[PDB]
Paper text:
The wbm locus contains three neighbouring SDR genes (wbmF, wbmG and wbmH), all of which have been annotated as nucleotide-sugar epimerases/dehydratases. WbmF, WbmG and WbmH are all homologous to Pfam01370 (NAD-dependent epimerase/dehydratase family). The abrogation or reduction of O-antigen expression as a result of wbmF, wbmG or wbmH mutations implicates all three genes in the biosynthesis of this molecule, and is consistent with the hypothesis that these three adjacent SDR genes catalyse the UDP-d-ManNAc3NAcA to UDP-l-GalNAc3NAcA conversion, which is probably required for O-antigen synthesis.
In WbmF, the last 30 residues form a large bent helix that covers two faces of the C-terminal domain. There is also an insertion of 14 amino acids in WbmF relative to the other structures, including all residues from Gly198 to Arg212. This extra loop extends over the nicotinamide end of the cofactor-binding pocket. In the WbmF structure the interface region is extended to include a short antiparallel β sheet composed of the residues Ile151 to Ser153 from each monomer as well as the loops that connect these strands to the bundle (Leu154 to Pro160); 2131 Å2 is buried in the WbmF dimer interface, which is equivalent to 8.6% of the total protein surface. His6-WbmG and His6-WbmH copurify with this compound from the E. coli expression host, but in order to stabilise the protein in solution His6-WbmF required the addition of exogenous cofactor, and this is the most likely source of this molecule in these His6-WbmF structures. In these structures, the bound cofactor is buried within the core of the protein; in the case of the His6-WbmF structure, the 14-amino-acid insertion supplies an additional occluding loop, further blocking release of cofactor in this conformation. The SDR triad is conserved in WbmG and WbmH as TYK but in WbmF Ala131 superimposes onto the Ser/Thr position. In GMER these residues are Cys109 and His179;21 in GDP-mannose 3,5-epimerase (GME) they are Cys145 and Lys217.12 In WbmG and WbmH these amino acids superimpose onto hydrophobic side chains, but in WbmF this catalytic cysteine is conserved (Cys133) and there are two candidates for the basic side chain, Asn213 and His90.
Residue numbers in the entry:
A (entry chain A), B (entry chain A): 8 to 132, 147 to 301, 306 to 355
Amino acid sequence: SKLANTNVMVVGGAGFVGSNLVKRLLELGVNQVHVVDNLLSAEKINVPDHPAVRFSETSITDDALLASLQDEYDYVFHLATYHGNQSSIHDPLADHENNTLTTLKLYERLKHFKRLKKVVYSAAGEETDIVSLHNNDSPYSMSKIFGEFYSVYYHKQHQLPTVRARFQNVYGPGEILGAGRWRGTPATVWRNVTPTFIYKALKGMPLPLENGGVATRDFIFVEDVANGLIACAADGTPGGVYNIASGKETSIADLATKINEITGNNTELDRLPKRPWDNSGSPEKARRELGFSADVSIDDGLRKTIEWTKANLAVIEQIMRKHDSALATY
Amino acid sequence: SKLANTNVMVVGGAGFVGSNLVKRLLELGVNQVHVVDNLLSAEKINVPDHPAVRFSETSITDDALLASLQDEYDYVFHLATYHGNQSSIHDPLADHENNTLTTLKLYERLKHFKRLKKVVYSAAGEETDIVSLHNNDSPYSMSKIFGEFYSVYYHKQHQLPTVRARFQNVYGPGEILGAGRWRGTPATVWRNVTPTFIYKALKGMPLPLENGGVATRDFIFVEDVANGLIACAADGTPGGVYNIASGKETSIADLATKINEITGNNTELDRLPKRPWDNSGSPEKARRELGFSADVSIDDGLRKTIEWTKANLAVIEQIMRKHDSALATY
Ligand SMILES: NC(=O)c1ccc[n+]([C@@H]2O[C@H](COP(=O)([O-])OP(=O)(O)OC[C@H]3O[C@@H](n4cnc5c(N)ncnc54)[C@H](O)[C@@H]3O)[C@@H](O)[C@H]2O)c1
Ligand SMILES: NC(=O)c1ccc[n+]([C@@H]2O[C@H](COP(=O)([O-])OP(=O)(O)OC[C@H]3O[C@@H](n4cnc5c(N)ncnc54)[C@H](O)[C@@H]3O)[C@@H](O)[C@H]2O)c1
């Protein structure tokens, strides 16, 4: 691997995608991983106790931390965000600090570093660089896009070797319901459909389907996402963008169906047939240019995710329970 | 006028466009104007000593000021920026604070105000709401676009009655060379081609043309811009965008030629013929929907601007001279 024996920074490295990227980097034989993470939406147990892992429990927007940074990194993965859509809507200023300003202050610091081979930014999901002012359901979605603007600017103006990796609907081990601090809404606990469904199935309760589960999504397993981020780092064109995607869609009804089959959850599912009006990212560029393919099936990824959830269920419950009081008063 | 007897806030109201908008608002018989301006790129003499004008010499990002704001405004004009392209490139963080965060914190505060009929945002120049990640020569240009994203979001999510007014190449009385603090580069003094040309012509010196002055621009007189902003306030569709534009292009060679004719500047101009490759915003929407037309000719506007510059030349020179030391060491 081009990443063997390298020094890498993972901003947001204690998070869901981050922690899995860190695991993989260590597997690939990196020299050092510097995790920078304020634990706003993460648990310390998702960092490793590793001699190669240095952990700064600090915001990447902290001026002292930024000024302390040395030109000793080959690669930077910028994965920090304000998790997620619902939280951002609740408090756009909390989102801005942890989602927009993060990227700007990081790049501003990194712009004169010469050891950097690649700076990989996790963007929201061929690849086009045209955007509408009207997309944008949340401050979160806007912050993600702003990070792409910054990634293009810093490349053009300062030759910062940025690569934007667009993904969506990641799932897998290491996504903990209720991870971090209360960010204003029940989505702090119920972060995403897949871990919510897995948790509820493991507890033997009915999976709540919205509108018969007709919505489809391209789910991608987190270990494929980690490998895709690494491919972007190694071989992605500076200034460029790649979809990191499975190219396969699964209905929420089928997601639920599979989670129930795997867990043994015997409870009813109110599912409806999908109609053309219910749903009216290509992986080709990454495949062709980076040799990257996200090949873990929804069935295999779900099994792995459920296995991890089962093994860590008590810990996850203790973490969920810290938000009981905020949940009850929401 | 719909603005007669209203309470209006002008963020950035001590500036070039702002001060002229304030003058016009007072002419239209507004009840109160609250100018909020940190004077970062403005002079106090551009505010009026008026019983109707309240001046807060404070950033619009100041938390105390924001929390102090009352639901007592009919109209808000958000004209603050970090002046301008060159400065923003020099210090993207200074730009962010005074160009991106300004809009976000303002809107976040204004979002539950009920007396607001319109919030008018000065954007950078039919009207489309699709943008490229690759436009964007500066952090300034990105901040302007981000403000449009915010203006659309806050309208959709919170019914904030935003109107984006896109203009460019404003000129006229009240633009003072060297206004405000040093923002890192000589552009602090030499702000824009028109006042630079007028100042130099009045001093009897050769106007410096770049590449024979083949570049063309749609110049618009500041009093037309003020009236256009007022039309947006009165009649602009919430969530909407309008070009505020003359629809007429002038070459920098012709700009220079006219300034020399008006001032009597007898010095040479190195001008070249414009070729098709030298230059390879429609006013129709504003005309049709708002009854607005920017009809002041380049010849008439230049005369008015030169007259004002002549009358205030000593004051402008004293203001320019404060940057002598920063100029000499740049
Ligand atoms: N999971 C998905 O389906 C998905 C989809 C598209 C894009 N993304 C992007 O992937 C990246 C990782 O997201 P995730 O799903 O792992 O969520 P996450 O919340 O688990 O991870 C983000 C991490 O950023 C950290 N963080 C927040 N503010 C910080 C700050 N100021 N300084 C340093 N760290 C800070 C959090 O504590 C957390 O560990 C994000 O940039 C996100 O927007 C995720
Ligand atoms: N003049 C043009 O050709 C042009 C073209 C397109 C758009 N605009 C836009 O028009 C608006 C006015 O620009 P201008 O040309 O009058 O420049 P300007 O610099 O004279 O005015 C901007 C004002 O904002 C103030 N300001 C800066 N930071 C502030 C803050 N944090 N809080 C409150 N006030 C702050 C400055 O002190 C200044 O008075 C801007 O939004 C600008 O981006 C101007």
